[PDB]
Amino acid sequence: MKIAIINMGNNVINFKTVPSSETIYLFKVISEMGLNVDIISLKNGVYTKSFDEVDVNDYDRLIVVNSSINFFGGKPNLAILSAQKFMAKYKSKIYYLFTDIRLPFSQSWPNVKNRPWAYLYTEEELLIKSPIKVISQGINLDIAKAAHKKVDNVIEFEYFPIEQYKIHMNDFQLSKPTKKTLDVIYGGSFRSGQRESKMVEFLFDTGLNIEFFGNAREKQFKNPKYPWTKAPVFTGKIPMNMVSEKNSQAIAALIIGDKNYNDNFITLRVWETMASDAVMLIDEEFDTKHRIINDARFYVNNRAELIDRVNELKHSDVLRKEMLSIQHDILNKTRAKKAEWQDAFKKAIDL
DNA sequence: GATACTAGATAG
DNA sequence: CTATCTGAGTATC
Numbered sequence: 421m422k423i424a425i426i427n428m429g430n431n432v433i434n435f436k437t438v439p440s441s442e443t444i445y446l447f448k449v450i451s452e453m454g455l456n457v458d459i460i461s462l463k464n465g466v467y468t469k470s471f472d473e474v475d476v477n478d479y480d481r482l483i484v485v486n487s488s489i490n491f492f493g494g495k496p497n498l499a500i501l502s503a504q505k506f507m508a509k510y511k512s513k514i515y516y517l518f519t520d521i522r523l524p525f526s527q528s529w530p531n532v533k534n535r536p537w538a539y540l541y542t543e544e545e546l547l548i549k550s551p552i553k554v555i556s557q558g559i560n561l562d563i564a565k566a567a568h569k570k571v572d573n574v575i576e577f578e579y580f581p582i583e584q585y586k587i588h589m590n591d592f593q594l595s596k597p598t599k600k601t602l603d604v605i606y607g608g609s610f611r612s613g614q615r616e617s618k619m620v621e622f623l624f625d626t627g628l629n630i631e632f633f634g635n636a637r638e639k640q641f642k643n644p645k646y647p648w649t650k651a652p653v654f655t656g657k658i659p660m661n662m663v664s665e666k667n668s669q670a671i672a673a674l675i676i677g678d679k680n681y682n683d684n685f686i687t688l689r690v691w692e693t694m695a696s697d698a699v700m701l702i703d704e705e706f707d708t709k710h711r712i713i714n715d716a717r718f719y720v721n722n723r724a725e726l727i728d729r730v731n732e733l734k735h736s737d738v739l740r741k742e743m744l745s746i747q748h749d750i751l752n753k754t755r756a757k758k759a760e761w762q763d764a765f766k767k768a769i770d771l
Numbered sequence: 772g773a774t775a776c777t778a779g780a781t782a783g
Numbered sequence: 784c785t786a787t788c789t790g791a792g793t794a795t796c
């Protein structure tokens with residue numbers, strides 16, 4: 421049994437980019453299950469073998485981390501072109517890891533064929549004919565199917581909480597008490613404005629000391645429907661392996677999601693925040709039944725409630741420490757079901 | 772004539 | 784909002 425995992429549209433090297441990081445963590449967690457897996461990317465490297473140096477059909481299973489098909493600058497995107505070229509030659513079922521609602525599987529040929537540099541490729545090279553099974557991080561398979569309505573070779577849909585890989589890694593450990601220099605923190609990208617309303621509501625004009633780290637930029641928030649005057653402090657992106665330690669600099673860390681994530685997706689930040697030294701404050705809309713933690717104190721309905729909850733936490737170390745103890749305990753209860761999670765993943769990829 | 776990383780705008 | 788069209792600014796093993 422030999423498994424290959426690739427990221428469909430991003431180079432994989434280290435933890436400097438989120439797409440590369442996710443691919444490496446998945447490679448790592450699968451390896452820790454006792455499976456023989458290789459990451460195939462553009463070049464040979466510490467964690468990867470090159471697309472041009474292996475035979476895709478030497479693998480019994482081909483796992484593909486989702487990505488968009490974006491030819492930046494209208495120019496060829498080697499990551500996506502090489503990945504689909506690799507996928508097109510595979511003669512078995514492909515397992516598409518659907519971890520981001522914005523990234524459903526799609527064919528690149530229909531996009532490439534109308535490009536001026538189309539002559540560089542052919543339908544035979546890029547058209548993926550293998551059947552695809554979508555492993556949805558979201559429990560709602562109707563949303564997953566709707567996202568893939570345009571493609572016809574996707575024949576299977578199954579839910580699996582992929583993002584738990586963070587807490588099941590062999591070397592996982594909760595964050596220790598950390599010096600507090602921030603009231604609230606949130607790390608991520610602009611996500612093409614798919615979450616602008618929520619970001620503005622909970623992170624802007626709060627009067628609190630807030631930091632927004634990641635690839636998001638102040639200039640990106642310009643939708644006239646979600647006005648603001650004061651912004652949080654935007655800082656640069658950091659390696660994914662350091663996210664919980666970064667979150668730990670704040671009294672609290674925010675949990676929000678895209679509309680289609682509400683009561684559907686559990687995201688990496690839920691675990692990264694839960695494991696940090698920052699109290700997890702969740703947007704009520706994201707988890708209306710409080711399935712994450714059965715304690716209303718961890719939930720906020722709007723900006724005013726977030727402000728009040730944060731001040732309560734700063735005013736009472738006893739309360740803050742109690743809540744951290746609780747979220748840490750809840751996380752451990754899920755970590756206790758590691759074997760169950762590993763087995764379910766194996767079955768998801770027909771093993 | 773560097774190279775790597777990262778969808779935004781417009782139409783229907 | 785979904786389908787379709789257009790195609791660059793910032794950061795650097």
Ligand SMILES: O=c1ccn([C@@H]2O[C@H](COP(=O)(O)OP(=O)(O)O)[C@@H](O)[C@H]2O)c(=O)[nH]1
Pocket residue numbers: 437438441607608609610611633634635656657658659660661663676677678687688689692
């Ligand atoms: O500087 C940063 C900011 C974010 N992240 C990662 O990016 C994820 C968030 O991704 P995204 O912006 O797509 O938001 P989501 O939809 O996951 O909430 C976080 O959970 C981290 O794992 C990271 O590695 N570095």
